[PDB]
From TrEMBL, chains A, B:
The gene is clcA. GO terms for molecular function: antiporter activity; voltage-gated chloride channel activity. The chain crosses the membrane at residues 4-24, 45-68, 148-172, 184-203, 223-241, 262-279, 299-319, 326-347, 359-384, 391-410. Homodimer. Its main location: membrane. It is found in: Cell inner membrane; Cell membrane. The record marks E174 as: Mediates proton transfer from the protein to the inner aqueous phase. This is H(+)/Cl(-) exchange transporter ClcA.
Amino acid sequence: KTPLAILFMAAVVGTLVGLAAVAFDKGVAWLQNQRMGALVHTADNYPLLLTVAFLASAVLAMFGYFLVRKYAPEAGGSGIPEIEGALEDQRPVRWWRVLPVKFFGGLGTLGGGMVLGREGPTVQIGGNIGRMVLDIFRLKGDEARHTLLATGAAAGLAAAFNAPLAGILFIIEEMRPQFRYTLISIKAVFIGVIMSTIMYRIFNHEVALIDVGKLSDAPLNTLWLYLILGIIFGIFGPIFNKWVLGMQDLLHRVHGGNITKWVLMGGAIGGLCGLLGFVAPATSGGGFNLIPIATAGNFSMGMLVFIFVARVITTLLCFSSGAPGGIFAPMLALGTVLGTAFGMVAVELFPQYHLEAGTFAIAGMGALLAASIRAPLTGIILVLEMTDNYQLILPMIITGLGATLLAQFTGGKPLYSAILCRTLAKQEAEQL
Amino acid sequence: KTPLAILFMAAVVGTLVGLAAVAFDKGVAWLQNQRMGALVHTADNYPLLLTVAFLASAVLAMFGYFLVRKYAPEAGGSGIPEIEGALEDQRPVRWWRVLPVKFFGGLGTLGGGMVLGREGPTVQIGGNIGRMVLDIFRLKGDEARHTLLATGAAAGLAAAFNAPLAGILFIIEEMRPQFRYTLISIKAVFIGVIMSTIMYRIFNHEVALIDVGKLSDAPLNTLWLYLILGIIFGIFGPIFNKWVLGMQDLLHRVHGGNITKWVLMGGAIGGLCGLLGFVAPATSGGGFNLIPIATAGNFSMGMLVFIFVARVITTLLCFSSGAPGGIFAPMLALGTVLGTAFGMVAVELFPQYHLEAGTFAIAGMGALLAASIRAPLTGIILVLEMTDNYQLILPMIITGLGATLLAQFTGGKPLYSAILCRTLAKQEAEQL
Ligand SMILES: [Cl-]
Ligand SMILES: [Cl-]
Ligand SMILES: [Cl-]
Ligand SMILES: [Cl-]
């Protein structure tokens, strides 16, 4: 009955996921530029600059926590576990509530300077837009419910990163298990991902979303050092996931689910990350402003160690508090400062290999998206599409598959699966 | 064990496809810039230069017509109606026989300035490489055979056009019908296609395969003219399909299968394309040269009529003779010439629209792929991502989905489906 109307509506999904995505990116960039642009006006007084860097980030984050805790308490956090749990018919898709809250409260949170990603809002906005097109064009059956939820979600990562290949390979490796799939479902997801990057590339004509320049090569007597980098990253992956879920119920003890104490904790958390945008800008922000600085070596090793310790204690504070933001971009810059700190000691230990710390940074950039969030194939092609260094593929397979092999040996679920089974275990804690 | 094995070999075949397609593209460009590098070296005798432009491209074509007729007769033509019949278990995949002569016979056919594409001898080289690494690794299953044959075929377009989105979308519209598809079959197709653009973007760092230079945006009040462009292409497409298969019948009358009369006819055809690649370079060649010159508005209206009738003669003279080469790039250069002629008779008839002949050439470029091959979604994502004009997506849909409306209404089969059902008619002719 529906051979081609589901493929027309998938292009309608992919058009809106790519128009509501680049309006989100232009809204967090307009808010970031006029929050840093509000500090150059009061540059004469130093304590007045710190006040309006705290308060302009606090009331932007308090605007984001209030919209989540009052109107849609599922837009908090990433939103990828809420779409991953909606494709299994376990979580509801309330697009009339999450779409004005993940957009406008996700702006205020990300444009306020919190250490959170563009991809968490965009994947959940895309999952709700695909339900919105499904509801305003009333389609029957679960055959169209889940193929319009798969697109939008896959079209969201395709517009949050300009990654059409990594957007489809995300939902293959994360949300859809080993079964048999209709070719119309595969066709409709492709039209939505294609329409998502087209609406990105209409309004964003730049290549190299992470622009580092074309770096050195990795010779084959060097590729064993990227296997050591997978051992370091594959151990930290499950350790970081214990810290994410360990602070989700540690910051939950500050409040008790009280909305007036959640937004006052999120305004102190959001105001601290706007305070750390003028004092030390390398320890806050979404992370994408740090990846090209850390790749082509500008830091020391004492500063690069300090950046890593200060960024893990702000990635945890931003994500686990219940703010509408992603976790890829805080962890892409977290694997870049760890790959550079590994790359800076590999130059000194092995001067006969003619090494470069930037090749270990681009290799280790998607090695935390392989160990912590166990999607190694998605994390490799994402870094290759963002950072156009395609000659660094054989170090990326060595460090991306050696990370996800030891992430299973040490014992670790994916992060979006571990968050989802902690929200499914609590929605069944009221329904006895 | 079993499923992770064929995912590893997908990266093996896609690396091998993307390296054999780069070596094919660099080898065709080496043979082209050696007979045209020795072109100005004979700038003292113009009748003798017309002889060493004929004969240097004739014996290059005679090497390509003899490798096909002696060794692998299933390597003559495109090769897309030999992998798409191989996925239906009707044609054999002789990777020890086709893969040498689709490479070395294609270096002399395409390097001799003939009107053929690289997408023909890279899909059949691609699908044979996936069968090549099925027998050297000794795999047993039949769907594990089909997911390695479709992996390299989809990696063939992705390393010929640098279009991974069009490589996946081509084996859904044209090569595979609707079924229940295993997830690792979809995953292994994705791995070989991303690994071939990785191998293509290591060597070729071009941001666009065709550079026309940011043509204008088409307003909504001008958007009805792309419907007439698809109406015109949707009629000519079925007419061009009967000319491909009619010149196939007409040229199989100089020779009844005779290998001496095949390669002497193929050397006169291939020597003429080296002859009319010096005195009139826009009538022969593969076609990727005059696409930036057509959309720039260089040719006049009486010249574009001369270019169209001469390129539609040398496309049927070359493809329907039996030469190992594709027909996409001759038909992208046939829709660009017909699209420029439409945009130049509409920029004078409608001065109120402030039109441009380039927006009708880019839109009309993939309107003959939607009419002859009848793969509309592939041809839209082929023209853009080769020409970075994503702001013409709404023109390209109307001359896209809308040129397949009159392609079916006129009574036109797809081209590769019409060659395959004609090849399989000769297959069951002698044996039955
Ligand atoms: Cl979350
Ligand atoms: Cl996320
Ligand atoms: Cl053919
Ligand atoms: Cl072809």
